[PDB]
Structures are given as C-alpha cells and as structure tokens.
Amino acid sequence: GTSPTQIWCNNSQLPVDHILAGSFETAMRLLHDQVGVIQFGPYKQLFLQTYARGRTTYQALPCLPSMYSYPNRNWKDAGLKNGVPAVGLKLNDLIQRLQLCYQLTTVGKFEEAVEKFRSILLSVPLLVVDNKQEIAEAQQLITICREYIVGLCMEIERKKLPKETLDQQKRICEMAAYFTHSNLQPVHMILVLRTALNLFFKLKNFKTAATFARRLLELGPKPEVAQQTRKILSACEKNPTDACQLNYDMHNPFDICAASYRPIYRGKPVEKCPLSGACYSPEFKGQICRVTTVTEIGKDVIGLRISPLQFRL
C-alpha cells in the first residue's frame, strides 16, 4: 500500500513535514526552491534531529521486527489518505531561545550569540505555523536574527582591524557608526551608540559625536551612562565640528553589506539573501550568504512557506 511517510510527503509542501518523513531529497528541494538554501551542510544536524522524532515504535509480536507508528497532527480527521505529521517545533520555542541570544549579546559573548542567532534563523523554515499573523512573526523573527548577526559580525571585525593608520581609524569609526543603524533592542542599541560616541570623540569628529550622544540619551540608558554621555556631549558642543569627512551618512538610508560592511545607500543596487534579507553589493551575487551560510545571495525564490495558509486555490 502507500506508506504513511509517503502520504505526508504527498500531503504537505512544508519542508519540516518532509524531513519528518525522511524524504531528505524532497525536503532539500523544497528548501532550495522556497528559500535559497544551496548549502545544506549546516542543516545536517537539524535534519537528523527532526528525522529522529518522526515516528514511534511498538512491538506487535515477539521476536519479530517492531512496528512503527506515525503520529499525525490532524490525527482525528486524517484518514489513511490525509494524514500529516505532528508538529514538534513551534514558534514560541524559537522566540524563547532568542532571549538567550540577547543575554549573550549583553555579556559580549557575540561569537556565541551569532551561533544561537543563526541556529534560530535556520530553524524558522522548519516551523509549521497556524495563523497568518504567526507567519509574520516568523518573518520578523528571522529579520531580528540577521540584524544581530550582521551587526555583531561587523563588530567583531572592526575590533580586529588595525588602529594605526588615520585611514585605518576612519575605517573603524565608520564601521562603528554603521552598527548604530542596526535595528537591535534598546539595551544593545544603547551599548553600540556608547561605543560609537567614544570613537568619534577621539576622532575629533565632534559634530557627529553630538548626534550619537543625543540619540543615546533618548534611549534612557542607566544613569551613570547618561551622565557620562551628557559630559561628552557638552564637550562636543564647545567645538561642534567634524575634523574629517567620513563615508557615513546618518540621514541617508543604509543597507549594510554583510560581507564588506560598506554602506549601500537607498536605491543603489543590492543583492539580498532570499531567506535572511541580508544585503550584499552586487559583486557578491551568486555567492553563499555569510549570515545564513546556507543560502545563495542572487537566488530568486518562491519564499518561505511555513503554513499551508500560504497555498491558495
């Protein structure tokens, strides 16, 4: 007859369903078309893990091979024909993990934070989502992950680059400033602003520093920080002026190149990761996304398909 796993495959477009089924090739294809995922290698743990949960086992008779049971999320209604695998991974689970990521960011554990963030980001396509808004949250969740990943990754590099040349220093300040734009939560956003302010201050680009200081204050950082910020701000006011011109436009909209960590203003051509939304300069197109690590930058895709609602007829 037809195996239950096969039934699941026939029944659902969702990639997780196929993984549960054990149909890797099918699942990979779905991930490849719906999302960009060219490089499956980072996926392997997720697949096996997901795969393991798919079916239960019980023994009909002794000394014979054990039987397998396939749980269905719609067990009641599903007949033999319309079964679909039980869930097992949910949006809330992913959201919960996010806090741990936040914690690591605050501590300065950025490298570890990236891993947790990326782990969640990759996991999003696995989900089966019940309602339309819930789908939006998933998309939003992914966005948050890339934002941190690119931002944190940019930060790690900035620290690495050499301080010695003036040009080198200008580069650092620029990158620090770029971080400012990243959409993080206020606790983190404040932290980055704090950093940028100092770099700009030493740079003697006081005018720009003043703007950062004001933005920081609005956030409402702890009192000690706020006081320090006010102190710096007043100093900046004495000589509001930027000594050097930097390749940074606070006002102009940006898009940080995930690879280059260079600004891409407004309209200027950009290539984006189908999955993450990470942005890259046109040169990168066709390459593996640094943020996602699985995806192809240039790839056009159907789009994430977490819920059956997405399919319409």
Partner: protein
C-alpha cells in the same frame, strides 16, 4: 488449555514469566511436552539468548524444536542466513507438510526478516492456527494494506474474540487505523497490563497510543517506568527520543537517548537507518553544493 498461561505470558512480552511457568508445567502428553518446549525456547529467543536455544536443541529433538532452532541460528549467525533461507526454500517447496504449525511460524518468521513478505505470507496462508492469523495480520500491516489486515482480524475475531492474541491483533490494526480507534488500542494495552502485568512490550504499546494522540505528557510515565526496568530497550529509547523533542527537553536529551541506543544495540535497524540517512544527506549536500 494447560499451556494457556505459558503461551499468554509469551505473547504479552513477559518472557521470563513464560520461561518460569513453562518449567513448572508438567508434560502430561508427548504432544504438550513438545509445545511447552517450543514456547520455552521461543521465550529464550525473545530474550536473545540464542546460545541457549542452539546448544540445548539438538538434532534428536522434535521437528517443532528443530524449526525453532532454525530460526535461532538465523538470528544468531548473520553469515548462515543466506544458506538457511536457501535450505528453507528447498524444504518449503520440496515438502508439503502443513500440519507442523510451529514450522510454518518459524519459517514465516525467517522470511519476514529476510524481507520476503510474500514468502512468509505464503507460508502463513497454509497454517490454520490462530497465531498464524495474528502473524498474518502483522505482516499485512507492515505492508500497509490495512484493508487486508481488517479481513484477517475479523477472521480471527469470529474464532476467538476474547483471546489475548486476538486482542493484541485488534490493537495493532487499531493503531494503524488512526482516529478514534487509537483510544480503543490504548485501552486494550492498558487492560492487558493491568490484568497480566506491565511488560515492556505493553508499556510501549500504551505509550504509542498516547503519542499517536496529542498526549505526549501522558506518555511520559509509561516510558519512564519502562526505562527504569530496562535501559537499552530499543522501543523505549526510540520513543523517548521522540517524546523528548515534543516535551521540549534539551536537545542533548534526545541525543543522549540516541547514543544510549547505540550502546545497547549497535546493530538495531533504527540505528542503521539513522546512519543511512546521514549518508544520503552528505550525498545530497554534494549534489547541491557549489563546485570548487
């Protein structure tokens, strides 16, 4: 039936109980004595004490025992298997004897492992016994032809509704059916455990029923109890891995059970499949991966 307790203990899954009782029972008949020995060894096979069966059953033993021993060697020696099947094929074709039910069951069992469902089913077709019917249904379920399975079940159902063997069979069909049926399967497993005794087999069956339905948490107790009795029990560990993920246990937990399974039985087909999946995944990765 004098043997009733011994056999019943066997089907439920409490092998040791079967063995103990088998010894206590008195022969009272050359026929019965043979049946008793058959179950006694069958129990040892369940236990995986192959050596016991191979050593004790000797050529002089009754043909029924010989069949059991045949199965034992098949399980025990991987190398021997092709040779055994070949001989089995020869014996099956070159010899009519239907009467030996034990032979049919053992032979069918070998075919089943051989993954020659047709042959096993073919053999079982000849056998009249109630057990033969139960085995037949099980094979049909694996075949995923529930419909055929249902027919056999009723067939046995007419003969003996109350028999535990029949009840187990119904539960199986039941579990396959899905839906409201699942609850029915759950009760039968529960009732058996209550009456006879919770066996690892029975506990997992209950767990499977609960898991089929959403009730992951309810499943926890049965698996936990089963695990306590026997770590390394294949069905239990597998169920635990599945259960753990639904519960939201830490990923390490799922991994731990999986590793534990490997320790208990490197060979276990679940493990092999897992490995197989890993292999093709790597294979697939190369397919998608960019060239360099």
């Amino acid at each position: 039936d004098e043997l009733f307790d011994v056999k019943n203990a066997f089907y439920i899954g409490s092998y040791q109980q079967c063995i103990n009782e088998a010894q206590r029972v008195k022969l009272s008949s050359p026929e019965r004595e043979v049946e008793r020995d058959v179950f006694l060894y069958r129990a040892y096979l369940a236990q995986r004490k192959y050596g016991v069966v191979l050593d004790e059953i000797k050529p002089s033993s009754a043909p029924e025992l010989q069949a059991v021993r045949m199965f034992a060697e098949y399980l025990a020696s991987e190398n021997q298997r092709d040779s055994i099947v070949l001989e089995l094929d020869r014996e099956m074709s070159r010899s009519v004897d239907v009467t030996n039910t034990t032979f049919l069951l053992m032979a069918a069992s070998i075919y089943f492992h051989d993954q020659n469902p047709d042959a096993a089913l073919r053999t079982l077709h000849q056998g009249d016994g109630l057990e033969c019917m139960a085995m037949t249904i099980q094979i049909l379920l694996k075949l995923d032809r529930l419909d055929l399975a249902r027919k056999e079940l009723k067939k046995m159902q007419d003969q003996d509704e109350d028999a535990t063997l029949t009840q187990l069979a119904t539960a199986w069909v039941n579990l396959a059916v899905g839906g409201e049926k699942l609850q029915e399967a759950y009760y039968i497993f529960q009732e058996l455990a209550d009456k006879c005794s919770p066996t690892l087999l029975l506990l997992n069956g209950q767990a499977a029923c609960h898991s089929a339905q959403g009730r992951w948490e309810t499943a926890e107790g049965v698996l936990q109890e089963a695990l306590d009795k026997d770590s390394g029990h294949p069905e239990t560990l597998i169920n635990l891995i599945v259960l753990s993920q639904h519960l939201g246990k830490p990923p390490e937990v799922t991994n731990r059970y999986l590793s534990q399974l490997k320790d208990a039985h490197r060979a276990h087909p679940f493990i092999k499949e897992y490995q197989a999946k890993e292999n093709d995944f790597d294979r697939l990765a190369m397919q998608y991966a960019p060239s360099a």
